[PDB]
Amino acid sequence: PRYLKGWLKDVVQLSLRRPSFRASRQRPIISLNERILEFNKRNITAIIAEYKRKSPSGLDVERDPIEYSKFMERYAVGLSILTEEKYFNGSYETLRKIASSVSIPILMKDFIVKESQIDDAYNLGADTVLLIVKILTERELESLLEYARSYGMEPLIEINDENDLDIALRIGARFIGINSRDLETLEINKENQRKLISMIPSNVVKVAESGISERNEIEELRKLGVNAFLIGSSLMRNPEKIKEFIL
Numbered sequence: 001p002r003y004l005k006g007w008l009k010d011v012v013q014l015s016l017r018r019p020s021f022r023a024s025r026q027r028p029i030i031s032l033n034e035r036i037l038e039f040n041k042r043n044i045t046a047i048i049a050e051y052k053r054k055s056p057s058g059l060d061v062e063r064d065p066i067e068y069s070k071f072m073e074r075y076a077v078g079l080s081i082l083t084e085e086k087y088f089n090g091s092y093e094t095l096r097k098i099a100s101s102v103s104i105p106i107l108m109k110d111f112i113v114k115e116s117q118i119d120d121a122y123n124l125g126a127d128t129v130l131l132i133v134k135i136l137t138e139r140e141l142e143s144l145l146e147y148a149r150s151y152g153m154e155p156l157i158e159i160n161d162e163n164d165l166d167i168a169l170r171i172g173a174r175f176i177g178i179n180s181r182d183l184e185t186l187e188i189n190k191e192n193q194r195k196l197i198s199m200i201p202s203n204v205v206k207v208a209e210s211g212i213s214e215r216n217e218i219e220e221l222r223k224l225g226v227n228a229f230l231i232g233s234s235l236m237r238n239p240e241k242i243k244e245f246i247l
């Protein structure tokens with residue numbers, strides 16, 4: 001991985017020693033990015049609802065993962081499940097239970113630094129994975145991207161700045177997440193996010209990530225060309241908000 005300091009250095013060390021999960025895979029892959037394109041075509045707001053019990057920025061919510069996913073399944077284009085254990089209180093177990101309970105696309109969200117984690121995502125039932133440009137070197141990102149594609153997954157490649165975008169474009173990313181939150185400092189910068197969204201090629205499926213809590217924010221973002229919106233905190237605190245978001 002890249003040179004890292006702080007909590008990022010720590011979570012990457014945890015991922016490096018994350019034990020693999022052996023399991024048989026049932027349902028075939030359901031492409032999240034393609035479903036996003038069809039929701040766009042049918043003019044339905046594409047929301048990726050995220051399940052996370054805890055977060056370094058302070059979220060702490062107790063809500064049943066299964067009931068939450070089944071409810072979200074009625075409206076969401078896909079689900080994002082945190083499997084990182086120490087900071088997000090996620091687990092492979094929760095992803096497995098959810099994947100057996102819903103039939104919409106599932107993104108496994110963790111800090112992926114090795115191939116066995118993609119093997120884990122596949123065996124657990126996820127349809128795609130998140131790859132973060134800022135914690136990986138360009139060679140690692142490229143290998144991991146090709147590896148995810150060997151399972152028929154188009155990974156969501158997350159960028160946070162212009163340098164991330166240059167790398168993402170160079171390696172041929174077709175599905176990009178623009179995170180308004182800096183992983184290292186936890187600061188949210190909406191303006192920087194909008195600047196990056198405006199630089200992305202029109203043929204790349206774009207997902208706005210972090211800090212969305214109002215329907216008007218979704219509308220502004222949609223006009224900038226964003227294809228889908230990944231929302232976690234506001235939905236975890238109030239699942240019913242999904243109804244306002246898809247209006």
Ligand SMILES: O=C(O)c1ccccc1NC[C@@H](O)[C@H](O)[C@H](O)COP(=O)(O)O
Nearest residue numbers: 055056057183209210211212231232233
């Ligand atoms: O949410 C956090 O507190 C946080 C802190 C440090 C690093 C990453 C973090 N979030 C990871 C990120 O993938 C977010 O969960 C999603 O983009 C959704 O964010 P939200 O809607 O909850 O603001």
